[PDB]
A paper describes a structure:
Defensins are a family of antimicrobial peptides of innate immunity broadly active against bacteria, viruses and toxins. They are small (2–5 kDa), stabilized structurally by three disulfide bonds, form oligomers, and are divided into α, β and θ structural classes. The canonical dimer interface of HNP1 is formed by the antiparallel extensions of the β2 strands stabilized by the reciprocal main-chain hydrogen bonds contributed by Thr18 and Ile20, and the hydrophobic packing of the side chains of Tyr16, Tyr21, Trp26, Phe28 and the Cys2–Cys30 and Cys4–Cys19 disulfides. Further analysis of probable quaternary structures by the Protein Interfaces, Surfaces and Assemblies (PISA) software indicates that the HNP1 dimer forms a tetramer or dimer of dimers in a crystal.
Analysis of HNP1 quaternary structures by PISA indicates that Tyr16 and Phe28 are essential for HNP1 dimerization contributing 16 and 11%, respectively, of the solvent-accessible surface buried by each monomer at the dimer interface. Analysis of intermolecular contacts within the Y16A/F28A-HNP1 crystal indicates that mutant monomers assemble into compact dimers reassembling canonical dimers of wild-type HNP1. The replacement of the bulky side chains of Tyr16 and Phe28 by linear Ala side chains allows the dimer to pack more tightly and form an additional set of H-bonds on the opposite face of the dimer. The new set of four H-bonds pins the short β1 strand of one monomer to the equivalent strand of the other monomer to form a two-stranded antiparallel β-sheet. Introduction of mutations at the dimer interface have no effect on the ability of Y16A/F28A-HNP1 to form a stable tetramer, which closely resembles the wild type HNP1 tetramer. Unlike the F28A mutation alone, the Y16A/F28A double mutant and the quadruple mutant LF inhibition IC50 values increased 6-fold and 95-fold, respectively. In the virtual colony count assay, the double mutant Y16A/F28A-HNP1 had a vLD99.9 value against S. aureus 7-fold higher than HNP1, and Y16A/I20A/L25A/F28A-HNP1 failed to exhibit activity equivalent to the vLD90 level against S. aureus.
Residue numbers in the entry:
A (entry chain E), B (entry chain D), C (entry chain A), D (entry chain B): 1 to 30
The structure:
Amino acid sequence: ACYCRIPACIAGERRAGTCIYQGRLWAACC
Amino acid sequence: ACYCRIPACIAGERRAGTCIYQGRLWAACC
Amino acid sequence: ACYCRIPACIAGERRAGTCIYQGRLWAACC
Amino acid sequence: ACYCRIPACIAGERRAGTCIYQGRLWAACC
């Protein structure tokens, strides 16, 4: 499904939203 | 890394936080 | 001072992001 | 009725959740 990443989603993935954990924001990548 | 799921993380996974996309919350599972 | 609201921010307010609580997303309004 | 803050909610307020904007997390204080 969607995988959390920083700083950005990678080739093939579309950024759908945001994840929050360990005190920070991440890209939610689908 | 961390994978977003509903309604909960599954066996082997630790819930680290939350994902936000398509208008809803998901479990962030690591 | 950002204030959490649904379904949207009101006149005079700028939507800056999102809040999460009580199981749902809200507009963060600044 | 919920207001976003860092680093914590203050006296009289209870932390209900989290806000996301300008690249960081905030406490959602109700």
